[model samples]
Target: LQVVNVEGIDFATKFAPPTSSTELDLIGHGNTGMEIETVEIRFTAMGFYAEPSISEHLQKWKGKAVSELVEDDSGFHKELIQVPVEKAVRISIIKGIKGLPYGSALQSSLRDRLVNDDKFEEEEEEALEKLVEFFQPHNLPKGANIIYHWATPDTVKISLSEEGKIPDEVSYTIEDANVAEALLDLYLGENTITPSTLSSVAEAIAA
Candidate 1:
């Protein structure tokens, strides 16, 4: 096993070079030797891969170093987040199910998942993408964080916090790996989409 440290927290796990199928796991949380009271978990899925849209975006950063990019700023955010994808999809799906008193394609599909516990291998992919795109502001790359401030269990407000800066707010919901996982389970699971096509999706739902 190899040991790794993050924000003063240490963990031990099997280590593999970049050539190997490496995956990082965070076992627990603690605050130690850190300037900010925050925890960061790094995850890399072995068998999973990125969608083409994300892949295209990552291509620009493939060989660049962190120093080469601007510090304390989100050039990527300004370029990508003009439209919120997951937030839109999440909201639309919930409202689509609630607003329509009668059955419709979106309603039927959602019903098949929530009520019927159904899975569509390939037939549902097209519809699913449409529903997502119809509501999605735009596509997003992996590692993009969406923050929300919590007012109640069901009443959380979206936070417009910029990248590389943490607001002084007391309570907030972050779009981290959990959000990514939930998205994969909904958008990429079943016969409609392939697990390998969205590896992060597969790993998220697996958790």
Candidate 2:
């Protein structure tokens, strides 16, 4: 497996597809780096190696440019999140921090979007609390790999590993359609996803 270098970090060119799929074929990849602006530190990077079926899942955006879908009012991200086919988000934290705070970052983003999507009621509240508990760690040292696997429309499989390795364990499974979409949206949604990732992703599916 080859890797693409991002901010001195190496991300695998290929990531594992869902276990339920038979092909196990090597697929295309796309990625971007995430950073902190106040101190001007770029700490993490991510990559996605989804199944062949995602091509058809995004066929509607084939001929479109990055700006068209990302800048304009397009439903691409939402549609992609609702596809139900398995897609994984692999995040490599370069700078060390507390795991709950790390997970809390996602939790907060999920909360904002869940409310935006009108899914932030009591059930979603408890789900977010449980999510933080699942990521329990006072210190998440550098090179920790956190993978969020959207196995189905209503569930996500959370796994952990060392740098550049397949997340070795299914640590937690959060079951809720709203939670699923909110998490995926954090990585794929237009606003929270940022420029580099949205562009990398847009170019990948456009072809």
Candidate 3:
């Protein structure tokens, strides 16, 4: 019952190798005079928050706070647990193309190149290869699993590993979903996949 979530849809699959608990990182360059940036995509265990339920055995203190009646770890605190929701793939981008701050024409052009044009696949794949290479040293996980990410700079930073594998100085995660998705698609390296194709696959698995 391994699954991978694309966008919000889940795709269940029997294959896809299991990855290691170890994490990997990759850094890439921007335009001239701009600082180097980092981006990461890792496959690992995933988790979700679940609502707590009152124990049927404790009927006497139904009106009181559950915290007062039960020890935190024994009840809600321990309940703050995670399940194997997916063998999740997580991504973090620590930087993007430079120049938006000064409104340089190159800024818009670069942004367009990265965000609007599929022609940028060559460069995107080149950059993403570094990440895949990182995973080579550590074996990837087994079975299929969901991939999820938040496209905010702050959130991405949080997702990044503490290892100095990727830079953290400056990045724009949310401003370029097109670039992000494009990079992911390239990394996935599935030539037959299209938006509709993935949708159909998810639908079939869900059904």
Give per-residue CA lDDT, model 3, range 34-119, as digits (tens).
22366433222222211112223223434554334233233322221111111223322222222222123323333454555555
Report the lDDT tens digits of candidate 1 across residue range 35-77: 2457633221112222224334444544454333322352432
Give TM per candidate: 0.20, 0.84, 0.25
TM-score of 3: 0.25
What is the per-residue lDDT of model 2 for residues 82-189, given as tens digits with 9 covering 90 to 100? 764667766777777787887798789899999987779999999988998888664566777777777676888888764446665687888977888888777778
lDDT score, residue 161, model 1?
A: 20
lDDT (CA) per prediction: 0.29, 0.70, 0.28
* Model 1 pairs in collision: 48-199, 120-192, 121-191, 121-192
Candidate 2, 66: how far from true, in Å? 1.3
For model 2, state the Cα shift of residue 72 in Å. 3.7
